[PDB]
Design a protein around this ligand. Sequence first.
Ligand code: GTP
Ligand code: MG
Lengths: 51, 216
Amino acid sequence: SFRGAPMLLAENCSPGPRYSVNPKILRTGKDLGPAYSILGRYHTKTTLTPG
Amino acid sequence: MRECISIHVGQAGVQIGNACWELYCLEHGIQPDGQMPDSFNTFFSETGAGKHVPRAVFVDLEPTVVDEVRTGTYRQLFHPEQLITGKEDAANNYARGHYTIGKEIVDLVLDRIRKLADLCTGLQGFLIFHSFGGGTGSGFASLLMERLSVDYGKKSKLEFAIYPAPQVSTAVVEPYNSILTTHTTLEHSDCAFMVDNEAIYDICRRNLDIERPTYT
Ligand SMILES: Nc1nc2c(ncn2[C@@H]2O[C@H](COP(=O)(O)OP(=O)(O)OP(=O)(O)O)[C@@H](O)[C@H]2O)c(=O)[nH]1
Ligand SMILES: [Mg+2]
């Protein structure tokens, strides 16, 4: 008679490459990045000892 | 086809994955280098240079318990990308490492899941060792189950969970962070087995003959 069923296919589990990544979480965690803010000039007031 | 992937959340999760993986490495001979001095393919991805890579998942939020295993006696064997931890420890809190920063790192943990499991055919199940009483292995474990229930489909997942028994309680927030994860694991788990640190205690007392043990 006529012979084989050819068959095909596999399983696959994960959702392909459909998950973004840019969290900067360097394996053990989001490591670093320091943020320095501009400051001002410290001053004071005056007095009157004599004249 | 017989491959199983482990997931291990919490400080408890990594230090009870470590001893279990030591037993795994002893049950069929692989050196801590990760070389030869059907049992191999389920957990160890064979390389073109004879190396064996454990296909686990070790995830945390406190680096000081996972930084040790990348500087310990097994640091040759474990892949560095898989040993994930965080910057801030959740510290008995559900929501930091679920909404603010663990929202940001579940992205990379799921990327590592996708990168690890792509070279397999027979993913037969997942193994999760979660912390009911902790902060990391409660909240991040919960987020893992919420994403894994909908993205992997109807894949089997199993819980060898830990459960702070009412007699011996380490922290006081065991009715405070475990109830919400019990609600999570009710609808997003298939088999869940509880362990406690009181039954092991008296079997080590009378059935075993070792006094003053550690968690190790
Ligand atoms: N059964 C068992 N329980 C453990 C073990 N080690 C720690 N625990 C439990 O874990 C709890 C400690 O909190 P962790 O699970 O470590 O929480 P964490 O991973 O540090 O994350 P945070 O809570 O945010 O700090 C304790 O209440 C213990 O009961 C262990 O080796 N075996
Ligand atoms: Mg922790």
